Amino acid sequence: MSEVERALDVLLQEAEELCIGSSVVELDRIPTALEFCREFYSKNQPVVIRKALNWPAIGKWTPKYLIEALGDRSVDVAITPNGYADGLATQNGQEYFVLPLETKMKLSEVVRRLDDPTGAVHYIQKQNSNLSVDLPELAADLRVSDLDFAQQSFNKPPDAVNFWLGDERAVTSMHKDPYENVYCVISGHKDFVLIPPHQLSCVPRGIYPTGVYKTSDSGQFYIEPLRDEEGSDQFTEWVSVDPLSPDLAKYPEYARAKPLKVRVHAGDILYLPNYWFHHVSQSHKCIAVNFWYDLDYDSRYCYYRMLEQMTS
Amino acid sequence: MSEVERALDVLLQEAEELCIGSSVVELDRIPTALEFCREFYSKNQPVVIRKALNWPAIGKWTPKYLIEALGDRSVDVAITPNGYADGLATQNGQEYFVLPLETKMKLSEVVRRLDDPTGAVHYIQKQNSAADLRVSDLDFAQQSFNKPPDAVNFWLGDERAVTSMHKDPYENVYCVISGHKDFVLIPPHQLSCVPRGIYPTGVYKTSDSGQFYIEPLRDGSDQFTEWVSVDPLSPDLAKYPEYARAKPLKVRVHAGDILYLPNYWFHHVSQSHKCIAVNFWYDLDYDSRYCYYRMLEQMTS
Ligand SMILES: [Mg+2]
Ligand SMILES: [Mn+2]
Ligand SMILES: [Mn+2]
């Protein structure tokens, strides 16, 4: 055992014994601002609040209603053959991190293609504050003030408000974000697998060549590698494990992770704290809105960077 | 640089660019419980609140008044020859970590011996948990700790009494009643910059002749203690060059001020002569920072 490995062992053993990040707390009532700050924000600890929201959207947001309310405008949509936008796929003996095929099409076309269980996998996943930038009308059916219990801890308005509408086959592969995340399912349900930052040494991460999904004149999908001016591949660091069916012989370290499963239904709120690993699945035609707030830096970020150094 | 040292250098580089724990925040008024939780508790960030308390004590309490109040009672007094209780001391060519000679003498003699610079260094340290204090003024912090104080300690002592650098595993709310207290503080993540050593523990004892000496303490093979080796006021940067990378903070806390010293922060304390203070300890609520700190301790072992 190296000294670095001994230190990582100490970290994991202490966090296990102290029950750090070992569960998703489940509440039936929205907590006070002080409660949220003390018990979840300051501990970097996820919580799900059941049936917290009765926004008008939760009732009325249907694909048909959205087509009418948005005037059937053209929307940006991501397409993959496999359902893994921003995810690993193999071609000609090489594993790539692949970006989705991104295109524009009328919302009605998106919905028609969500109804074809055979064709390519579609997802309105653009994030980048796509709700407030590209679909501001939708904001009228939300009451963001209801999120105050959490916002007072972040102490700033959302840095992004995002809209998700997805196929059942669209899976978000495990990754982390540098934001505090308040996730609100409007219709259907989302299934989360979550892993806390301090378990970084149990999550295998690899450096992969990057590609993008393109389609041939025949409509056949393939991966086009991104190979830049310097000649080399364009590389991306990405989580290597599939949480739904992990290969513990290939990745012994993942045996030491304790992933947490939570399902979030229409009207539920999920607080996903900054730098938590998450893998996301969804019911068919699931609609969700999420609010991202920039993180307030402390020593835990510096420790996380140190862990990245140690596990490199 | 080795693997462990490359990791520590990454830690310190990231904390230096973000200036983590680079300043003791200064406040004019007592914050809300939410403000304190969001800004200070959750960030492990020390803060000093100026002229925050208007307790009766701050006016009344003196050696003279305390005499008449408790009535010349016998009190728990700590005594040292050098003024370094829980500090390092040399004897027989070997450096020891020495606990204080603890005794019980009546409080009128304490005051007499305080202004004799000829004698030993004395100070009173009591853990009794009154009507001259408005403890509710600290609710803002209590609500963030979500439990009453685990201890309330009274302190009265000599300017010669120096509390050497060390860390505590609890949240500290320090309230100065009379005089001022000088703190040198160091963030926990700078542990690798603070040189530590293993020392044989002892206790101070007086002779037939009243002469002080360190009695090596034992359980046989005698006990040992890990203790910080550097003196922050006159550091030896040639003997301890890693300490050049630490960035200590200095803060003076006056009568009526409140200092929040977060758990596991290194601190070296001094004070004016006959300074009086109280402080409230709260047992920490364990989080990821503590686990990282145990890891960091393993890396600097
Ligand atoms: Mg796998
Ligand atoms: Mn994400
Ligand atoms: Mn202390």
Author numbering:
A (entry chain A): 1 to 312
B (entry chain B): 1 to 129, 139 to 228, 231 to 312
Excerpt from the paper describing this PDB structure:
Jumonji domain-containing 7 (JMJD7) is a JmjC (3S)-lysyl-hydroxylase that catalyses the modification of Developmentally Regulated GTP Binding Proteins 1 and 2 (DRG1 and 2); JMJD7 has also been reported to have histone endopeptidase activity. Here we report biophysical and biochemical studies on JMJD7 from Drosophila melanogaster (dmJMJD7). Like hsJMJD7, dmJMJD7 forms a homodimer with each 316-amino-acid monomer possessing an N-terminal helix-loop-helix-fold domain (aa 1–42) that forms part of the dimerization interface, a core distorted double-stranded β-helix (DSBH, aa 160–294) fold comprising of eight parallel β-strands and an α-helical C-terminal domain (aa 296–310) which is also involved in dimerization. Notably, the crystallographic analyses on dmJMJD7 combined with previously reported crystal structures for hsJMJD720 reveal the unusual dimerization mode of JMJD7, which involves interactions between the N- and C-terminal regions of both dmJMJD7 monomers and is likely conserved in all animals making JMJD7.
We obtained dmJMJD7 crystals of His6-dmJMJD7.Mn complexed with its co-substrate 2OG or co-product succinate; catalytically inert Mn(II) was used instead of the cofactor Fe(II) to block catalysis under aerobic conditions, as was done for hsJMJD720. Compared to that observed in the dmJMJD7.Mn. OG/succinate/N-oxalylglycine/2,4-PDCA structures, this loop adopts a different conformation and forms a non-DSBH β-strand extending the major DSBH β-sheet in the N-oxalyl-D-alanine and N-oxalyl-D-phenylalanine complexes. Notably, in the 2OG/succinate/N-oxalylglycine complexes, Trp164 is positioned to form a stacking interaction with the methylene groups of 2OG/succinate/N-oxalylglycine; the C4-methylene substitution in N-oxalyl-D-alanine or N-oxalyl-D-phenylalanine compared to N-oxalylglycine prevents this interaction.
